[PDB]
């Protein structure tokens, strides 16, 4: 996260870290949506242009963290995966359209003051909150500058941008399953996600019922915090039926 601040303890209890076993390294961010399912971005697992194709046995999920490199004894929980599900129409050949994946944990995790699931939006919540100008929050342990890693989880709040502006900032073909967020060069406020933050959550707090909902997943960007550029996110509500389907087909 570039131009963000250190998170407070228990601020994002649904934040998850995808960690590689050998070499031991941070791969991406992810989110807890129930006691057995984690949501992330498909490019964190599969990306053939770079010979990237991870399997169940190559990863670990670490839940309840704050510090980026330390094993937080008696606070965090480490789980193994049972199954990984990538969206059938994820487009890694052109623009990362439908960049979403679900992972099933071997055993359910127990909630605590540091581990709690986030809610998935319903049509009406999505309709009222995904509006240009409204702010969301992104969290992660990724880089601090484009070219500089934090010791603790970082946070930044960003506004959703109008679709025309998103489309005129790049040469990539944007689709209805993506939205972009960030400040305009003219707003004198900065912030963006960067390397290491992919797969993590973009959340909003409902003023109707006071709950936090996950509206997007960190997907792609061109550089980090560049002026005239924005970050792109997967639109969770437009892919929700896919989500419901695998969960009540493969578990709960």
């Amino acid at each position: 996260i570039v131009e963000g601040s250190d998170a407070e303890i228990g601020m994002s209890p649904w934040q998850v870290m995808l960690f590689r076993k050998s070499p031991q390294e941070l791969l991406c961010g992810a989110s807890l949506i129930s006691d057995r399912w984690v949501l992330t971005a498909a490019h964190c697992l599969l990306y053939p242009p770079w010979d990237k194709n991870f399997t169940e046995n190559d990863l670990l999920v670490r839940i309840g963290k704050h510090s980026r490199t330390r094993y937080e004894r008696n606070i965090e929980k480490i789980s193994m995966l049972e199954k990984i599900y990538i969206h059938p129409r994820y487009n890694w050949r052109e623009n990362l359209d439908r960049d979403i994946a679900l992972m099933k944990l071997k055993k359910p995790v127990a909630f605590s003051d540091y581990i709690h699931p986030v809610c998935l939006p319903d049509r009406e919540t999505a309709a009222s909150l995904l509006q240009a100008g409204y702010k969301g929050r992104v969290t992660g342990w990724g880089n601090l500058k484009e070219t500089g890693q934090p010791s603790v989880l970082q946070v930044v709040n960003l506004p959703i941008v109008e679709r025309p502006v998103c489309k005129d900032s790049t040469r990539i073909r944007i689709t209805d399953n993506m939205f972009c967020a960030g400040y305009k060069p003219d707003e004198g406020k900065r912030g963006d996600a960067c390397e290491g933050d992919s797969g993590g959550p973009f959340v909003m707090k409902s003023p109707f019922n006071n709950r936090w909902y996950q509206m997007g997943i960190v997907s792609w960007g061109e550089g980090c915090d560049r002026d005239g550029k924005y970050g792109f996110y997967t639109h969770v509500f437009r892919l929700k039926k896919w989500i419901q389907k695998v969960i009540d087909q493969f578990g709960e």
Binding site: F19, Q24, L60, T69, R70, Y71, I78, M80
Partner: peptide, 10 residues
């Protein structure tokens, strides 16, 4: 840079 995690998670 990362601290070691206990062996029963490998």
């Amino acid at each position: 840079d990362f601290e070691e995690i206990p062996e029963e998670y490998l």
